[PDB]
Write a protein that binds this ligand. Structure first.
Ligand SMILES: OC[C@H]1O[C@H](O[C@H]2[C@H](O)[C@@H](O)[C@@H](O)O[C@@H]2CO)[C@H](O)[C@@H](O)[C@@H]1O
Ligand SMILES: OC[C@H]1O[C@H](O[C@H]2[C@H](O)[C@@H](O)[C@@H](O)O[C@@H]2CO)[C@H](O)[C@@H](O)[C@@H]1O
Ligand SMILES: OC[C@H]1O[C@H](O[C@H]2[C@H](O)[C@@H](O)[C@@H](O)O[C@@H]2CO)[C@H](O)[C@@H](O)[C@@H]1O
Ligand SMILES: OC[C@H]1O[C@H](O[C@H]2[C@H](O)[C@@H](O)[C@@H](O)O[C@@H]2CO)[C@H](O)[C@@H](O)[C@@H]1O
Lengths: 470, 16, 462, 463, 472, 16
C-alpha cells in the first residue's frame, strides 16, 4: 500500500540521489508534497517483487533494459507527455523507453562505460587489451597495478566479451530474435578467455568488486579502471589526476559496451501518478533539476536537449559518447533479465575457475543457471502451496477447532529467500531454520530466521536473517 | 466420539 | 436491448418510487423524455442477470455494497460529474461509490437501522438486548409482544451479530482482507446465540418477515421493531405514537448496523447515458428532486449537502446517524454478494433449528471466505509448479513460461508462436464445466503470453 | 484386569441372556467355574474401550460385523477348533468370522429382519412398500396404524435403502473395495426418500424407537413391525396372532436386509481362554446349549448343523432365511464401524428434517469412505515426495530413505545411526494433536528404519 | 489377490522352469493342488511392485542378494524348517538366506560364472584377460572372434571389475559397511578400463547382450563366452565341443565373480504358505526334485548335501566352485538393489562412450543414477497425488454431482512407467500420451498409451504401451 | 441459483 499524498522514489546508491532529494526539496516547497528518495540494495530485483503486490515506490529509476519486463508484468503506468515535452528530449532516448508502442518511462540520461586512467601513473593509456599484461608487469614493479574493475557484475566485462563477436540477442527486421543468442560464439569465448587469462596470470583478482576497484583507483593504487559517469565525482574528491578515454580494442575490434538509458518509471499501483508526472516533467527534466543531480553524481549525456548542449563540451562526455557509439543500445525485452543472470554466472564461474570458459558459456547459451534456480524455486513454491492446502483443509473441514484458541492467523507464505512461514497466531514471533541454499551459497541450518506475525493477522514486512551464516 | 476415538488412536500410536 | 430515447429506472419496492416517478414526470415535461420507474422483486439479483445481456434498466438504485460486484463484471458505466457537482455532496458518500479509483454511481442517501418503538406501550425503550426477554414476558401478559423485525434478511440481525465482535471483512492498510472473515468468532457466536435463544424461548418467531413485522408494529401489536427511514412513512399513516432511537446494546457493546448508501448507477449497456446523467444531476440530486422522494418514503441522511442541513434537525435523522456512527460503512467489494448469502443461510438455519449456531456459522465462515476456492487454488498452484519442475528437470531458448491464470488453468512452458490448448477447468466460481472442451491461449512470437485467453468453448454443466 | 478362574460374558439385552446364564449354570455345576452373564448398554462400543486396557468380559457376543474392527485392534484371541468341531457348523457361518485368514470368533446363529404382522388386523400383509401409505390411511380410521419399527438404528431401515441399489462396500475379486461406497446412489436416495415421505405424510413418527415400536405392536395398536427372531418371544407372551413373512418390495425390488451372524469372541486379554473355549465348544454349541438360549429368545437360524435341522421346520425360520437370502451377509471389515455411524446420522437427520435426503446421504458418503482422510493423506504423500525432491536436487552414500508412516508423518532422508524427530501429526483419525510435541524414530546403523516409531509424546487436543 | 488352493511360482526364464513344472506336476498328482510356473521378464523388479499390494506369486525364485530388501519391506514369510531338514543342506547356503537372524527363503543351488570356451577353436584357453586382444586378432583372421558375453548386465563384467580391487561393500566385524563402497577405487577403474579398451579396439561390441552372446557361441562364431551353469544345456544341444574353466586373471589377480545362491522365498501375503512349504521341502529339495530341474537347465552346486555329492564329480561343477572360491558370496542387504543399478549404468555408459570410465564410476560411487531416477519419480508421484487430491476435493465438497451420471470410478493412479491415469468412469477406455522419458530413453509423446477402467470400478492390470516408440 | 452463477461466470470468462 503506497501512501496517497506523497512521493517515494527509488534510485541506485551509486547515482546522484542527494542531488535528486534537492529536486524533491524544491517540489515540496512549492506543492507541500513530501518527496522521499531511497536507495535500496538490489532495487531492480526488489521492485518487481514488491510492486507485484501494489506496494513499492511511486517512481523507480534504473536503466531502460529492465523496464520492458516490468511493463510486460503490468507494473508500470503508461506515461502521457505532450508533443512539446517530447520535442525537449532526443528521439533515440524515447525509443529506449518504448515497449509495445506505448511509452513506459521518462528517459533521463545515456550511460556508457569508459576507460578511466591515472595520468600520473599512465600518461598514455593503452589502445589495446593485449598490452595490459605487459603493462601490469611494469607497474607491479612500482608497487602498483594496471587495471581493476568490477568483476561481479556482467555489465563491466561485457564490452570485452562483445568486442570480437559476442552479442545478447540478434537484431534484424526491427526485432530481436530471442532464438538467436550470441553468448557462446567464437568472439564471446575469446573475450572471456582473455579475462580469465588475466586472472590466471595474476594481473587481476576474481574477488574484485565495485568498492575494491573504486577504492583502489581513487587511492592511486591501480593505474586504470572501468566505470561510468557516476564515478567521476568520487575521483574529483580523491584528487587523482584522471582521464576518461576510449575503451581498449580486442583483436583490433572496439570494445562494445551495452549502452543504458537511465529512466524514471511510474508504478502502476501508485495513487500519485499526477504528482509523479509533475515532478518528473516540471522539476527534474529541467536544466536546474538535472544540474542538481549531475552536480552530485554525473549523469552522462542527458536526455534533455537544452542541457546536453552544455555537457557535450566536456571531453569526458565526449568519451562516454564515443564508447556509446562503438557499443550498442540495450534491448528492453523481458528476456534481458534471464540474459544478465546467465552472463553473471558465466563470468563468475569462469573467473573463479569453477568452470572452464567453454563450460560457463555453454550453460549461458542453454540458460542452465536460471533454469536450475527455477527448478529449486518451483519445488519450494509447490511445497509451501501444499502446506497452505493442509492448513485450509483442516481449518474448514477438520474437527471443530479450539473454541478459545486465537481467531486470526497469518497465513502460510513463502518469502523471496525460499523460507515457508507456517500459519501462525496474531502476535507470534516465528522461527524457521536458515535456508540450506540461497544464491549458490550454503548456510548453517542449525541457526534460525525470525519473522513476526503482527497483532492484526498480517506478516511483518521485515524478516530477520541476521543469524544465517555459511 | 471425542474421548473414545482418542482412546482408539492411542492404541494405534502405541503398537506403531 | 434497452430502448433509445427514454429512461427505465429500477428501485426497491420499499423506497419512495412514486416520489421518484414525480421527479421523472418533471423530467418528461421539460425534455419530452418518458421516464418509467419500476420496482421488480429481487432486483439486486435480476439486474446482473439481465444487464449481462445488454438489457435491463437505464439506471439502477441500490445500496452501494452490490455496486463493486457490478462494476467488476463491467455492468456499470463510469460517471463523470465535474468538480462543482462533487462539492455539492459529502466526500464520504463518494468514497462509498468508488471502485478501483473510478466513480461508478451517484450517492443518494445514508441508511442505517434504528430501534423503532411504540411510546404508548413502551414510554421507556430498553437500553440493552438482555432486558428484552423479561420485557416480552410483561407484554405477552397484555396480549402484545416486545419485538418483531425481519428475520429473513441478514441485514436486520447483523447489528446484533456485530455488536460483540462479529465482522464481515477485516479492514486494514486501506484494504479489506478477503481472507479474514469474522463471521465465526466468539462475538458473532454470542450475538446469534442470543437471537436463537429469543426464538427457542418464544419471544420471537423464526417465520417473521418484513411484512409480518411491519403490519404487527403498525397495528399496535408489538412494542418494538427494527427498520430503516423508509419505514417511517407507514408508521405516520398508522397513527402509532412512535419513537426512533439508538439500538440496544449487547454485552455492553453498541449494536453495529451495516450502513448503506443508496446509490444510482448507470447501466453500461444503456444508449441513454447522457439522459441518465442529466436526470440524476439536474433533477434528482436537487432539493426538489430529493424532497419529492423523501415525502413518499424518507431517504435517511441525504448525500446532498444543502438538503441534509434541513433533515439534520429531525431527531429521527439524528438517531439514524448515531446508529450509523456506531456501525460501519459496508464494503463495496464483489465478495459482499457471497458474504450476504452465507449469513442469510446461517441465520435462517440457526433460527429454524436445522443447525446449531456453531454449525451454521462454521458453514458461513467457509462460504464467506471462499475457502473451497483458496484450497483448490493452492492445489492448482502446487500442481502447476510441479509441471514446471518436471519440464525443467527433463530439459536439463525462448519460451512462454508456465503460468496459472485467474481461472485456474496452468499454461505449460510453450514455444514462441504456439497456440496452446488446455482442457476447460473442472470447477470455477461454484460452477462445474465440461472438461472435454478446451481453452486456448497464444504464446506470442516474442516469448510472451497473449493477454487474452479464449474460454469461449467452456460450457457449464447444468 | 479380568479375574482368573471365572468367566464374565457380555451379550446384548435383546438376546436370550437368561437362557445363556442357564448354560452358564450347567458349566458351574460341572467345573465349579462361576459364569456371570451381563448385558450393558452400548456394549459394542464399551468392549473396545475397556478391552483396550486389559479389561472387560472374557467372552463377547455380537453380530460378526464389529469383530473385524476388534481383531484389527488386537482385542480378540485367535480361536482353535479342531477339524471335527468345524464340520459341526455350516461353512458359510465360519466365513463370516474369518479375518485375515484367521478365525476370530465362534458363529452362533444367522439373524435377518423379517416383516412381522398382526393376522387379525391384516390377514393379508402388503407385498410392497408402496401399498403401505394407503394401508395406513385405512387403519388410522380404525384408530390403529400400519407400521412401526425402530427408526433410531440404521439396521432397520437399511433393507429399504438397499432394496433399489444402495450398498455398503462394493464386493468384487474376493475383496470389499473401501473406496466404493454405495450410500449415495440413486437407489439409496429412492429408498430413504420413501421413508422420509412416510414421515412427512404422518404414516410414521421420527421419534419411534425399539421399545415404542415393540410395545405398540404387542399391544395390538399397529398392524406391522420389522424385527428379528429375538423379538418373537415377546409376541408369544402378548398373545397377538402374528405372522412372520417376506419383507415388502420397493420399486419391484426385494428388500435387502444386512444379515448378521451372532458370534462369540474371546477377549485377547482374558487369562481364561481355555475355560471360554470349553464353555463355547462343549456347552453352548450343543443342542442343549442352544435350545436353552433359543427358548428364552429365538436365535434365528443357528450355526450348529444338528439343531438347525429341527428349527428349519418353523415357517418363521423359513421366512428368516428367505429374507436373509434376498439380503447380503455383512462385511466384517473395520470400516463397518464408520459405515454404520454415518448411516445412523443420515437417517436421523433426514427423518427429523434437519437435512434433506440429498444432503444427509452426501455427508454419509463422505463420512463412511473416510474421504477427508483419503484427501489429507494424498496431500501428505505429495508433500513427502517434494521433501525428497528438494533433498535430492540440493544433494546433486547410505541413508534411511524418505518414507511416510501409517500415521502421516514424513520421515526425511537421514544418516545411519540418527535418531530423527518430527512434530506430531496435526490430525489423525478424527482427532487433533498438539504439534509442539515430537515423534521419534531411529535410522539404524544398517541404513534401515527401525520398525517401531515412538509416538508416546503425542497428546490429543481436547475441550 | 493370490488364489487360495493353488501355487503360482515365479522363476527366471534362463533357469530350468520346465523341470520345475514337472516337480509341480508330481505335487498336483499327489495333493490335487495345481502348480503354475511362470517366468515374467524383469521378475526381480516386478515382484516387489506386485507383492507390495498382496498380489504376485506364492513362491519366488531368485539369487539371494535381492531377498534382504524383500524381507526388509516385509514381503517374505519367515520359513520354519526343522532341525533334520536343516542338516540336509549345507550351512553356508543357509547363511546366504539369513536376514536379521530370521531365515527368509530356501537355498536351492550355488551359481558362479565360469569361462566357457570352444575346444575346437581354442584347445588352450587363455589364462589371462591380457592375452585376449592378441587372441581376437588371430581369430578375426579366421572369420571368428575371441570372446562374447552379456555386456548389459553388470553381473557379467563384475568379475573383471573386482579382480584388481573393486568391491561392493566392505566386509568386517561380521558386517557390511554401507559407507565403504569400492566401486571407484584403482582396481575397479583398471578393470573397467580394460573392458572399455577391448571395445574401443573392436574386440567386443557394446551392444552385445545375453542372446547375441549365446547364439554366437552356440553357433561356433566366437571362441569363448562367460556364463553360468544354466547355459550348459543349450551348448549340449548345439553340439559345440565345449569346456568350462577358471576365469582369466587380470594383472595377475583372479577374476572375482559375485557368487549367487538361487533361493525360493514364500510371499508374505500368500494364503498357501503350508502348501508352499510342503512343495519346497518334500518335493523340490529332494534328489528327484532337483534332478528334474537340473536335467532341464543345470543348477550349479546344489544346496542339498545328498545330491551335490553326485554333481561334485562333474568337472564343470568343479570349475564352477573354483571360480566361486576366488569370488565372494553376494551381500543380501537391501542396498544391493541400488548397488547393481549404479554399476549397470556405469558399465553401459562407459562401454557406449557416453562417459569416460572415471566419470561413470564416480557417478556409481555418488549413487547419482538412482538419485536422479528417484528425483523424477518423486515429482511424478507428487503430481499424481495432487491429481488425486483435486478429484477427492471436488467430489466431496464441490457442487452437487450429476444425479444420472455414473457412480463408481477407477481412482487416479500412477503406474510403474510414470503415467498418471486420471479418475475415470467404470467401463471407460482411457488414453494418455506416451511418457516423455522412461529408463534413459525418450519417446514420441504424440502417441498414446491405453488403459481400461473395468465395469467394476477397478483398473485393468494390463496397460497398453504398444504404440510408444523412442525417437532420436 | 446455479443459473445466475453460470451466466455471471460467462462474463469473467469473456473478460479474461
Ligand atoms: O550487470 C548487469 C546489469 O547491468 C546494468 O546495470 C548497471 C546500470 O545500468 C548502471 O546504471 C550501473 O548502476 O551499473 C549497473 C551494473 O551494476 C543493467 O542495466 C542491469 O539491468 C543489469 O542487471
Ligand atoms: O439482507 C441482506 C441485504 O442487506 C442490504 O440490503 C438492505 C438495503 O441496503 C436497504 O436499502 C433496504 O432495502 O434493506 C435491505 C435489506 O433487505 C444490502 O444492501 C444487500 O446487498 C443485502 O442482500
Ligand atoms: O444399527 C446399526 C447396528 O446394526 C447391527 O446391530 C444389530 C444387531 O445385529 C442385532 O443382533 C440386534 O441387536 O439389533 C442391532 C440393531 O440395533 C450391527 O450388528 C451393529 O454393528 C450396528 O451398530
Ligand atoms: O546383473 C545384476 C544382477 O546380478 C545377479 O543376477 C543374475 C542372477 O543371479 C543369475 O541367476 C542369472 O539369472 O543372471 C542374472 C543376471 O542377469 C543378481 O542376482 C541380481 O540381483 C542383479 O540385479
Amino acid at each position: 500500500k503506497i501512501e496517497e499524498g506523497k512521493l517515494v522514489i527509488w534510485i541506485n546508491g551509486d547515482k546522484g540521489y542527494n542531488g535528486l532529494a534537492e529536486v524533491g526539496k524544491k517540489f515540496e516547497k512549492d506543492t507541500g508534497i513530501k518527496v522521499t528518495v531511497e536507495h535500496p540494495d538490489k532495487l531492480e530485483e526488489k521492485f518487481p517483487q514488491v510492486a507485484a503486490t501494489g506496494d513499492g515506490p511511486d517512481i523507480i529509476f534504473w536503466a531502460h533494459d529492465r523496464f520492458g519486463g516490468y511493463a510486460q508484468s503490468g507494473l508500470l503506468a503508461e506515461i502521457t507527455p505532450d508533443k512539446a515535452f517530447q520535442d525537449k528530449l532526443y528521439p533515440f532516448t524515447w525509443d529506449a523507453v518504448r515497449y509495445n508502442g506505448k511509452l513506459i518511462a521518462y528517459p533521463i540520461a545515456v550511460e556508457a562505460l569508459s576507460l578511466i586512467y591515472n595520468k600520473d601513473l599512465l600518461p598514455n593509456p593503452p589502445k589495446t587489451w593485449e598490452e595490459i599484461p605487459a603493462l601490469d608487469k611494469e607497474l607491479k614493479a612500482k608497487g602498483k597495478s594496471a587495471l581493476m574493475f568490477n568483476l561481479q557484475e556482467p555489465y563491466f566485462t561485457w564490452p570485452l566479451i562483445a568486442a570480437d563477436g559476442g552479442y545478447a540477442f540478434k537484431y534484424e527486421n526491427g526485432k530481436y530474435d530471442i532464438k538467436d543468442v550470441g553468448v557462446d560464439n567464437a568472439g564471446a569465448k575469446a573475450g572471456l578467455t582473455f579475462l580469465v587469462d588475466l586472472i590466471k596470470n595474476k594481473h587481476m583478482n576474481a574477488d574484485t568488486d565495485y568498492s575494491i576497484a573504486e577504492a583502489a583507483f581513487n587511492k592511486g593504487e591501480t593505474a586504470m579502471t572501468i566505470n561510468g559517469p557516476w564515478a567521476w565525482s568520487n575521483i574529483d574528491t580523491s584528487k587523482v589526476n584522471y582521464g576518461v578515454t576510449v575503451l581498449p580494442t580486442f583483436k583490433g575490434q572496439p570494445s562494445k559496451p551495452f549502452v543504458g538509458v537511465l529512466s524514471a518509471g511510474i508504478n502502476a499501483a501508485s495513487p500519485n501518478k499526477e504528482l509523479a508526472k509533475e515532478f518528473l516533467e516540471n522539476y527534474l527534466l529541467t536544466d536546474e533539476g538535472l544540474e542538481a543531480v549531475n552536480k552530485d553524481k554525473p549523469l552522462g549525456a542527458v536526455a534533455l536537449k537544452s542541457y546536453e548542449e552544455e555537457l557535450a563540451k566536456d571531453p569526458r562526455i565526449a568519451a562516454t559518447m564515443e564508447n556509446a557509439q562503438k557499443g550498442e543500445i540495450m534491448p528492453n525485452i523481458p528476456q534481458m533479465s534471464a540474459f544478465w543472470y546467465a552472463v553473471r554466472t558465466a563470468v563468475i564461474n569462469a573467473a573463479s575457475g569453477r568452470q572452464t570458459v567453454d563450460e560457463a558459456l555453454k550453460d549461458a547459451q542453454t540458460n542452465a543457471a536460471a533454469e536450475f534456480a527455477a527448478l529449486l524455486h518451483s519445488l519450494l513454491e509447490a511445497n509451501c502451496s501444499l502446506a497452505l492446502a493442509e492448513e485450509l483443509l483442516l481449518d474448514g473441514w477438520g474437527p471443530p477447532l479450539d473454541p478459545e484458541g486465537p481467531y486470526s492467523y497469518c497465513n502460510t507464505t513463502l518469502d523471496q529467500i525460499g523460507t515457508c512461514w507456517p500459519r501462525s497466531a496474531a502476535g507470534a514471533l516465528v522461527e524457521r531454520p536458515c535456508p540450506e541454499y540461497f544464491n549458490g551459497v550454503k548456510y548453517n541450518t542449525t541457526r534460525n530466521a525470525y519473522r513476526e506475525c503482527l497483532e492484526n493477522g498480517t506478516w511483518a514486512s521485515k524478516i530477520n536473517y541476521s543469524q544465517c551464516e555459511p | 466420539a471425542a474421548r473414545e476415538q482418542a482412546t482408539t488412536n492411542a492404541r494405534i500410536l502405541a503398537r506403531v
